[PDB]
Structure 1
Amino acid sequence: ASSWWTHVEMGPPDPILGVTEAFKRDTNSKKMNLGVGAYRDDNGKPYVLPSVRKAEAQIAAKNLDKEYLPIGGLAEFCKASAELALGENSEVLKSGRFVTVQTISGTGALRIGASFLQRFFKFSRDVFLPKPTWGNHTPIFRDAGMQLQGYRYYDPKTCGFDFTGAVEDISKIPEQSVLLLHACAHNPTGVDPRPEQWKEIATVVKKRNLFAFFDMAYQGFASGDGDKDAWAVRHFIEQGINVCLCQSYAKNMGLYGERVGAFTMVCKDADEAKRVESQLKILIRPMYSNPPLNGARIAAAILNTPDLRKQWLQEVKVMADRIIGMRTQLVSNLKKEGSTHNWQHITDQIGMFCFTGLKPEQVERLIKEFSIYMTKDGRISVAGVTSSNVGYLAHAIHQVTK
C-alpha cells in the first residue's frame, strides 16, 4: 500500500479511561469516581506510605549507583519477596527448591509466567480463568500464545462465591491443565473462598494433577494480615502442589509507578530451580535486559529492615481497616436509609473492588441523576468511598434501588 499503516484501525476506547474522563468533565459538586484503580486516603488524594519515604531517604543517603541489575533481578529483593510470600519458616526456603525473578510488577510476572508456560509447558495449551476475571488477564495469555477457557467463580444469585459450580468446573477441567487462581481479593469482585473451600479446591487440584497459577497482588492489603492472605498458597504448597505466584507490590506498598513485582515458581529440587532460573533469564532478556532498580531497591530496604517492615505492616493494616470501615459504613447507611435488600455480601467481600449487584439500568440512573460514575458491570472501588460522601452514595443507591 501507499502508507505502511493505512490499514491500521482505531483501537476501542478503554472503559475505565472513559469513566475517568466523564467524571473529570462533570461539573456537579457532589460527583464521585468509583472507577479508580488505586488506593486513596480519607481526603481522596493519592496516598504515599511514610515507610516508602523513609526508604527513599535512606537510599539517597547511601548514594548508590545505577548500574544494570542481574537479568533475574536484585537478589535481596527476590529473597525477601520469596520469604514474605512463603513465610519465614517455610520448608521451601530451607530446601531452596524455589526460583524468584524480579519483573515489571504483576502484569510483567503474569506475562513471564505465560511465556514460560508457552515455551515449556508441553502438557496443555488451555488456561482456565474465573468467569469474572481481571480484564488484562485475557490479553496477556492471548498474546503469549495460550488459549483461554473459563470456569464459574461468582454467583449472581447470592452475590457470592459459587463453591459448588467452581468445584464441578474444576473437576471437569482436563488433567495437566494450568489453572489461574486469584490468591486473595478477586480483582473485579473481591470474593474469596473460605479456608475449607480452599482445602476442597486444593484436594480436587491434587487429585486431577492440575497446575496452579496463583496471582497474589493484594497480599496484606486485603485484610491487614499477610499470613492469612497467603494462607491458600501455603496450604497448596504443603499439600505437595507446585504453584507459581505473581506478586505485585504496587498496592501493598503503594509503589504503583515504580513497577515492582516478582514471579516465583516452586520446584521439587534445587537443580530444577536453577534450570528454571536459567530459562527464565533467557526468556526475560529479549523482553528487557533487566528490571528497574529504584523500586526494587526500595522494596528490599523496607522488607529487610525490621523497623521499616513493622511500619509498613502497620500502614497496610491501617489502610485495610479503612477499607473495611468504609464497607461497614456503607452497609450501615444503606440499612439506615430503609433499603430492604440484603447487603451482607458487601461486608463479606474482601478487597478494593465490590459488585453491589446493581443492574446496568441502575448504573445509568446513578450516572445521569446523582452523577456517580461507575462501570456498567457494577464494580465500585471502595478506596474511592469517603467518610464524607458515603452517606450520599448510600442514599443514591437506596433511591435507585427503591
Structure 2
Amino acid sequence: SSWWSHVEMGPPDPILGVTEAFKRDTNSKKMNLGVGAYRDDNGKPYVLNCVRKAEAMIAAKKMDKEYLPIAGLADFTRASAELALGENSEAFKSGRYVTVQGISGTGSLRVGANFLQRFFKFSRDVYLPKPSWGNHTPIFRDAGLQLQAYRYYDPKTCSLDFTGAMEDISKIPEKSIILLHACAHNPTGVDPRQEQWKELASVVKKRNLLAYFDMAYQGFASGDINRDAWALRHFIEQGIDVVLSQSYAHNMGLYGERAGAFTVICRDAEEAKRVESQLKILIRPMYSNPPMNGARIASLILNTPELRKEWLVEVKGMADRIISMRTQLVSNLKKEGSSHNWQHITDQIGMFCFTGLKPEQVERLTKEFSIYMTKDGRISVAGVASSNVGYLAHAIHQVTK
C-alpha cells in the first residue's frame, strides 16, 4: 500500500473519449463524428486562409514570447467584447464591461463559475437546459455550485418545448443563475425563435435571475455573426447585465491553440475596474497568465480589416457546406430506401444533428461501420465530406432498417 493504491480507474470522457477510441480502429473507412470539429470537403482538418496569413504576419514581425498580463492581450480582449456586443452598443461604448482572455470556452466558463462561487452571494444554483453539453455539469460542480434544470427539448416533436421551458423558468427562485446557449444549442441544434427569445428576456428580467450565456458557436447558426449574437444583445438592451463565455475554437478553427474570453456586464466602468481586479486575483493562482499564440492570431484577424472580411466569407463558406451535407444526408437516406422521417437533420442548425438513435444502434454503427459518435445519438455533420456522405447514409439505414 503506497500513496495511490486507493485511486480507481475512472471512465473515458463521453466526448473526448470518442476520439481516443476512434484513433485505434484500423478500418480505413472509419469516421470520427464525435467531437464537433470542422472538416473540409475532403474530410480533412481545415486551417482557415486568414489564420494562415495571420500566422505569417506574426512570423515576419519576429515577435517576442514574453508573459502577457494576467487578463490577456488587450487588443484581443477589446476585440472579443466588441464581436459579442456589437460596436454601437451602449455597454461597449460606455465601458461597463470587463473581458478577460480565457483558456478557450471551457477555460472562460470555469473562470466565470469560480468567480461566481466566490462573489455571487445570492445563490449556489445554476440552472441548465435539458439536455445541455455534458461538460457543463462538472464545470459548475468542480467550481462549487449546485446544478438544477429547466425543460428545453421535446424528443417526441424534435423541437423546443416552449410551454415547459417557460413554466420551469417562471418558477426558478429570484436571483438564481440560469445558463443559456447564445445560438446553435448543443446538442439539440434547436434555438428559440426571436419572438421566443423576447419572451424569455421578460421572464429573466422579471425574476431577477443572473443570465449566463455560453457563446461557443457565433456564426454557425445562420452563417452571419451579428445575427447569431442577437439574443445576447437583446438581453443587455432590455437591462439584463449578463455574464458570458466566448470560444474561437470552431468559428476560427483555433481548436488546440485555446483562445476564448469571459465577460461581465457591470453597472459602470468603475464597477468594471473592481471586478477586473478580483478576476486577476482568481486567475493568478490558477494558471498565472494565458496562452499567446491563439490570441495573437485572433486579434490580428479581428483588428485587420481585410483579414476580418476574409474571415467572414470563410465562416459563411463553412456553414454553407454543413448545410449541403445535411441536405445530401437526407437525400441519401431516401435513396437508400429509409422509411423514417429524417427532417430534423435538415431542420437543426450548427455542427450537429441530434439523430435520435438508441445506444444499441450507436454501438452497431461503431462495430460494423467504424462510425464513431456520442452515445446520446449526437453526430457531428460538420465532419462529413462529399465522399463519405453515401457511406454514412447506408450505415444509418442498415442499423435503422
TM range (shorter): over 0.9
**Which segment drifts farther, 21-30 or 277-286?**
21-30
2:264 is paired with a residue whose SS is strand
Distance 1:293 1:370 in 2: 40
**Cα distance change, pair 12–399 in 1 and its aligned pair in 2 (3 A):** closer
**Cα distance change, pair 21–71 in 1 and its aligned pair in 2 (3 A):** closer
Q: CA deviation at 1:297?
A: 1.2
Q: CA deviation at 1:17?
A: 4.8
Distance 2:215 2:302 in 1: 17
1:215 is paired with a residue whose SS is strand
Distance 1:171 1:304 in 2: 41
Match of 2:212 in 1: 213
Q: CA deviation at 1:351?
A: 1.0
Structural mapping, 1:192-203, within 5 Å: 192-203=191-202
Distance 1:149 1:78 in 2: 31
CA contact (8 A) 1:34 1:380 kept: yes
**Which segment drifts farther, 130-139 or 74-83?**
130-139
Write the deviation string for residues 363-396 of structure 1: whole angstroms up to 9, x where unpaired.
Answer: 2332333332222210001122121111222222
Q: CA deviation at 1:29?
A: 4.1
Match of 2:86 in 1: 87
Match of 2:345 in 1: 346
CA contact (8 A) 1:130 1:151 kept: yes
Match of 1:395 in 2: 394
CA contact (8 A) 2:184 2:220 kept: no
Match of 2:102 in 1: 103
CA contact (8 A) 1:152 1:165 kept: yes
Normalized against structure 1, the TM-score is what? 0.96
2:369 is paired with a residue whose SS is coil
Write the deviation string for residues 314-346 of structure 1: whole angstroms up to 9, x where unpaired.
Answer: 111111111111111112222333333222211
Question: RMSD of the alignment, in Å?
Answer: 1.6
Distance 2:45 2:126 in 1: 35
**Which segment drifts farther, 151-160 or 14-23?**
14-23
**Which segment drifts farther, 53-62 or 386-395?**
386-395
Distance 1:138 1:206 in 2: 25
**Identity percentage of aligned residues:** 86
Letter in 1 for 2:68: L
Match of 2:267 in 1: 268
2:362 aligned with 1:373: no
Q: What is the aligned length?
A: 401
Letter in 2 for 1:346: I
Write the deviation string for residues 261-305 of structure 1: whole angstroms up to 9, x where unpaired.
Answer: 111111111111111111111111111221122211111111000
Match of 1:13 in 2: 12
Q: CA deviation at 1:183?
A: 0.7
Match of 1:65 in 2: 64
Distance 1:149 1:68 in 2: 39
Structural mapping, 1:94-243, within 5 Å: 94-243=93-242
Match of 1:37 in 2: 36
Match of 2:3 in 1: 4
Provide structure 2 residue ranges, at least 5 long, that are not aligned to the other structure.
none
Letter in 1 for 2:45: P
Match of 1:304 in 2: 303
Distance 1:181 1:50 in 2: 32
Write the deviation string for residues 105-162 of structure 1: whole angstroms up to 9, x where unpaired.
Answer: 1111101110111111000000011121112111111111101111112111112222
Q: CA deviation at 1:362?
A: 2.3
Letter in 2 for 1:81: S
CA contact (8 A) 2:80 2:261 kept: yes
Q: CA deviation at 1:63?
A: 1.6
CA contact (8 A) 1:223 1:321 kept: no
Distance 1:113 1:235 in 2: 21
Provide structure 1 residue ranges, at least 5 long, that are not aligned to the other structure.
none
Letter in 2 for 1:232: A
**Cα distance change, pair 22–294 in 1 and its aligned pair in 2 (3 A):** closer
Distance 1:37 1:52 in 2: 19
Distance 2:269 2:23 in 1: 53
Write the deviation string for residues 217-257 of structure 1: whole angstroms up to 9, x where unpaired.
Answer: 11113332001111110011111101111001111111111
Write the deviation string for residues 171-203 of structure 1: whole angstroms up to 9, x where unpaired.
Answer: 121110010001111222222111111111111
